[PDB]
Write a protein that binds this ligand. Sequence first.
Ligand code: ATP
Ligand code: ADP
Ligand code: MG
Ligand code: ZN
Lengths: 50, 54, 76, 286, 70, 287, 199, 54, 191, 252
Amino acid sequence: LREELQLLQEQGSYVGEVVRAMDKKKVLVKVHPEGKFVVDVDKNIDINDV
Amino acid sequence: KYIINVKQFAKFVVDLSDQVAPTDIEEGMRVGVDRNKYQIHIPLPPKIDPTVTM
Amino acid sequence: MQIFVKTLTGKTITLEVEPSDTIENVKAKIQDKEGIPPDQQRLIFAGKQLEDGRTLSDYNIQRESTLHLVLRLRGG
Amino acid sequence: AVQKVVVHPLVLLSVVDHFNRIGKVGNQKRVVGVLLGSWQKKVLDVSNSFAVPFDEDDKDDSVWFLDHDYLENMYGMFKKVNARERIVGWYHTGPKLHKNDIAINELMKRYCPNSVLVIIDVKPKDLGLPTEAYISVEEVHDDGTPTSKTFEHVTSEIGAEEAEEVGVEHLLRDIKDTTVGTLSQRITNQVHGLKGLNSKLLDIRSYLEKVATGKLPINHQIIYQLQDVFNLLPDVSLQEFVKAFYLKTNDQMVVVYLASLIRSVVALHNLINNKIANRDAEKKEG
Amino acid sequence: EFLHAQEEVKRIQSIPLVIGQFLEAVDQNTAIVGSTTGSNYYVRILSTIDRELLKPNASVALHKHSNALV
Amino acid sequence: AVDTAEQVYISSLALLKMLKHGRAGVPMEVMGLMLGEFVDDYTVRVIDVFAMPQSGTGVSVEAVDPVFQAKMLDMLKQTGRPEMVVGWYHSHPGFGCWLSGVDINTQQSFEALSERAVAVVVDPIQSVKGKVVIDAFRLINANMMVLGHEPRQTTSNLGHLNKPSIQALIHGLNRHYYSITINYRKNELEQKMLLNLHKKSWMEGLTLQDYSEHCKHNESVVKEMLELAKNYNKAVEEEDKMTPEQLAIKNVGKQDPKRHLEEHVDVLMTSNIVQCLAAMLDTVVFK
Amino acid sequence: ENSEKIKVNKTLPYLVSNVIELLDVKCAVIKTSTRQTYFLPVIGLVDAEKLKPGDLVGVNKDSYLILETLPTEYDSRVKAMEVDERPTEQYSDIGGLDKQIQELVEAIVLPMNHKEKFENLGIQPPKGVLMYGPPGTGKTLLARACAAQTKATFLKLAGPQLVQMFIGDGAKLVRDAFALAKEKAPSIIFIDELDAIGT
Amino acid sequence: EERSKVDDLRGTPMSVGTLEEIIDDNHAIVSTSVGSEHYVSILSFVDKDLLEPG
Amino acid sequence: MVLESTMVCVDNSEYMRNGDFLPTRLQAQQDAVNIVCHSKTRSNPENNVGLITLANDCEVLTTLTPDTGRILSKLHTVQPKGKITFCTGIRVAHLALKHRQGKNHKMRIIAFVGSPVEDNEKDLVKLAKRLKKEKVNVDIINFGEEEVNTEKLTAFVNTLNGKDGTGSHLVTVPPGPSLADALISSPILAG
Amino acid sequence: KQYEKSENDLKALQSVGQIVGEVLKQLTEEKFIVKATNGPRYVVGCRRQLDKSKLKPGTRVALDMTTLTIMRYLPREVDPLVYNMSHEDPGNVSYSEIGGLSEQIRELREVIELPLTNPELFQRVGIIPPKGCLLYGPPGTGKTLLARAVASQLDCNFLKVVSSSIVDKYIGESARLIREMFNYARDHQPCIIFMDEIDAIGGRRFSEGTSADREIQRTLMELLNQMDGFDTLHRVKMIMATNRPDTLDPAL
Ligand SMILES: Nc1ncnc2c1ncn2[C@@H]1O[C@H](COP(=O)(O)OP(=O)(O)OP(=O)(O)O)[C@@H](O)[C@H]1O
Ligand SMILES: Nc1ncnc2c1ncn2[C@@H]1O[C@H](COP(=O)(O)OP(=O)(O)O)[C@@H](O)[C@H]1O
Ligand SMILES: [Mg+2]
Ligand SMILES: [Zn+2]
């Protein structure tokens, strides 16, 4: 119950539809209400995610 | 007492900042609006003047 | 003459100015001795706001006078 | 025509502050300051306050000094930072009040028409005893008795604000006293709900035997105020209680009779599922 | 401490809040919901919310800051 | 020089000034000065906090005439006790806690005029349920950016008192400023009397629940556990007699176990065993 | 001290809006140019008896307080019609039609000049005068000289300009042309080629 | 070394902008995806040769 | 450049409702306050003057402040209708001199006696032996009616600053058109 | 007085502003589902004493800016296009600027003044109180001064429709303006309605008609059902006035 409550006090995450992007640890994410964004990947995921 | 719209946000009643003079500012002219105080900093000409030399 | 600028932080700053000087000279001296710009300094003498357009003799500031240094307070 | 006052949980902390802001060198053993309030319609509210230098000599007990210039500036300073708050009265601590409190009150009624005082307790805090307030009234005395002041009592309550109540819960962090209680807090609410009962009842006979002897003169006001207590308590005889008490007692024993039925089937089912899982892990381990 | 956690989950929901719509569900205790102000989000859900009530685009509740399926 | 064992000692009546002044002007960014005392090198206390009048908007805040501050501190010397200032504060209602553009400019002015001048950030519209997100920050010099920034591990208590979240380490942490730890100076004759006046009662224990709605409430509790007992009959016995898997969809996304059916019984006892016994005392006590 | 405190807290950047209604239990609903509706208990600086629904008041961006009003705004086509300050012209420029000139001087200037010439007799002056006949003689040029000498805030009105493409434009345009004519008290109305909309 | 400092001098969540016009004075006008137009400055490592309106 | 806290103490008792002088005794005592507040002004602007009454209550009308414009507004319209009470008047003046903003000023109290005092000889000598243990110099100025060579006042001046004290002068004005010339001969400089 | 004007502005300066919203439905005893004019939908409560039975599902309230709970409810918008259709003075006339029409004046005063003053004469006889009348004829004999007469005598509420400022470029605006007009008329119960020039939106409902005229037909069909349709129009009477009573709808 504390584990469910500690992650509860945390802001929400967005969604972005990606069909394709570029390499070199920068991907191309387009959100729905706004345009595209060149962002950075995480260290828990890989790069080959196109 | 300049009435100025963004046409995407709203219409604002603002003033020029203390860097320019109230001589060139007329109706229908681009200005440099402050991001917070919304003041006119520098007026912008609408891309003058590539239609005289030709 | 020697003045005692009694700041609001419990620190007395001694300055060597002249009665014919103004406020901008005192601000420049404070900036040179420390590192505060002149536009962020408000000298108060006996609860009176000092203006940069006057001298020290206009406010009856003689030798050894207690001042008050107030900085520019602004947040965002 | 004050119904009650509302003391926010901020001002008494400023008193406990100023009770310690003088105790390093002061032997005054009383703190007198200025109470600010927000008189809304009929109920009184107190949001902020401050203090004022005040002394009092025990000889002749009629000499006092208030600082008016410090009262004029600092209340004027608070008006500039907040043009919502204004004066409502004053306060002092110490249970035994000195007798300049009429002399202090009748001066500063030129500030507040409905001037009010609030007595708090810094050291008498062990039993259940809240803050106390009186009111400034001017009558003769009763009918044919000589004239005096007779500060009448106004009842008091405590109310916070939205941030002033949520900020309290973050401070305590020791027992926190959860809402609706699981049979342990509720019985103690009847235990220490009754520990204050006889403490009042011992106090009634203590003043009564003081005046049954006749040391202090009587007040007829408290006599009939005590007399309607005893001839208005109910007497349980027949068909009004002994019928109607069992009608709700034999009502509430039906629904706790479900707790006998249901909870016995709960733990029996948990017994079956363990005794199935025990013997099946046992018969298949070998 | 267990009576503390009951009251904490009790007062996480009784507040003024916004109304969005359930869009999709990733797996156990995580879903994808989009609010009525556009801008489809990604938050987590609670175990008190029954998982057999969230097949269609149903009307749900969301926090203003944590933005979760409260 | 700089340690990682500093603890600001705010008082209880300090923080109540912080939330009340912060909730007073919500959409206009209130702004005040923080008054305390430096008792040694790296423990600082702050007990009483006054406020300043403002004229700022919802994203920035300006100040007023500085003849108000020095006249205020002069009058606080003769009444109560005098101190020298130890920092300042504001309110950031919209976002969380990080130091903005002019916030770092006024920080450089105060740590040069005064000694160290810790700044405090308050979100008034976040401290809602039971918790507050107040934090205090402190500027570090930019010259010592090739050596430690808050170096020199003396203790090991500086790791679990603060864990900076992703929204904090993007603006200034840790290349511009750093965070500092907060404990609460709780003592006696202030804390015990704080609860001796708020969550107290005299007659609340020995008072009836006014049976016009008490037994009326028990109607709508028996009928809903009636329906849960309708739900309970089929559920377990069908699950056990069809497949003994002790698993799927009756395990992954269900809510009708033996956790739900007795808590309505638990509420119904505590609401009535107390209410039965509360009507037993006054039969003896009140004649 | 109070007026100084009003001055510093009076910021200059405003937000124009529109009053929808005005109630008393003093209270006014405000719709901004941000497509957002707001409600206030107290209006603020201006009075409740000086406002009307359809004013472009100056509202604070944060506290939403009516700070200044000064709207004076209209349609671009109506403001394009305000034609004043011409060179003068004498009545002697028109020869031969002097009776119709005298019938105009006996029609319009004396309701404007001497209102007390009528109010003692008890009669009411008319307000409609038509020029008709062969085109190009005395229709527009006579009232051009009448507006030249007797300045009374001339306001022309063309015929085909009332006929727009979309439906429901002339009823907007004519009625906005007369709301401007009502607020300008010495103003007059001149309508030309009225047969173009005269069926 | 120098390539890593300038690649880390800018912010990491880089937003996709849109050029509208170019003034040759170390700033220009751009356009966001929401159509809000911002009178911003341009850097000097931006390789000012391929900059076209559009 | 002398730093003191001059505490003026007027009398608005009922016995001031007469004129033994050609002007008004209230106008005589008011102008007496004017010539001493202007005296302490020109000697050192770093002092403070505050008025206090003693008739039927010692109401602090003005706090001891270095401003003088608050006093000049309150010197008028005093409405003298009270009974003179002098024994509490010293103790409330010394209580005002403890509540000060600076403890580097000297202590001087001037008082205006425009009515005869009726007090025990024990009550004056207990206050006199108190101010000896507190090192407080109080000046006594008589207005209007006055018994010449009183027992109570003269023994109070003696027991105030005995064995080479300050020289708190006892001002004995005669009735007649004489103004404060007896108050500006010695006590304006040699107090 | 100038000081009192200053202190009122100081109290006015400490103001917040409230979010105008409408109640959609009631969830529980303390949960109300409301919605702003463009914003999202909320789940909030009431303050202390707001009489939640008055919160009908479809009223208009004013929410807090930060707490977002309901402060004060509001009756209804009055859409300032029709604000000017009430505030005007007829002529301050008293049936003395009219003559030679008394057979028709009294007959019109019979059908209108009786239900708004004297309903006992209509309960004693088994008749429903009538709806409005019509003025038709050649231009010049009354037709505007006659309504100017009756709007000077016992003007509880009055609306004067010009019947030509009610359509525009927008194709669904016309019937929306009529519905919100009568709801203002319905709410302020004892009102009288005047409409000049019914011929402008009249017309016989005919075949294929170049869609600019199809909107006027759909405008007219809205006016039919609002006058005599499902909603029982009570205390509201309608003085229609035309100049050519030939080409109107027989259903009208
Ligand atoms: N029957 C009447 N009795 C008295 N005065 C009248 C009568 N008819 C018209 N008038 C006069 O006419 C003026 C009002 O015009 P009126 O309202 O009759 O025009 P109308 O018939 O409404 O025109 P239209 O039918 O074209 O709208 C008033 O000044 C009034 O003096
Ligand atoms: N009697 C006249 N005197 C002077 N100029 C005249 C006369 N008659 C006609 N004109 C000229 O003829 C022109 C047309 O007159 P105008 O008012 O435009 O008539 P319309 O409006 O019918 O065309 C005028 O500009 C005027 O200069
Ligand atoms: Mg008509
Ligand atoms: Zn900040």
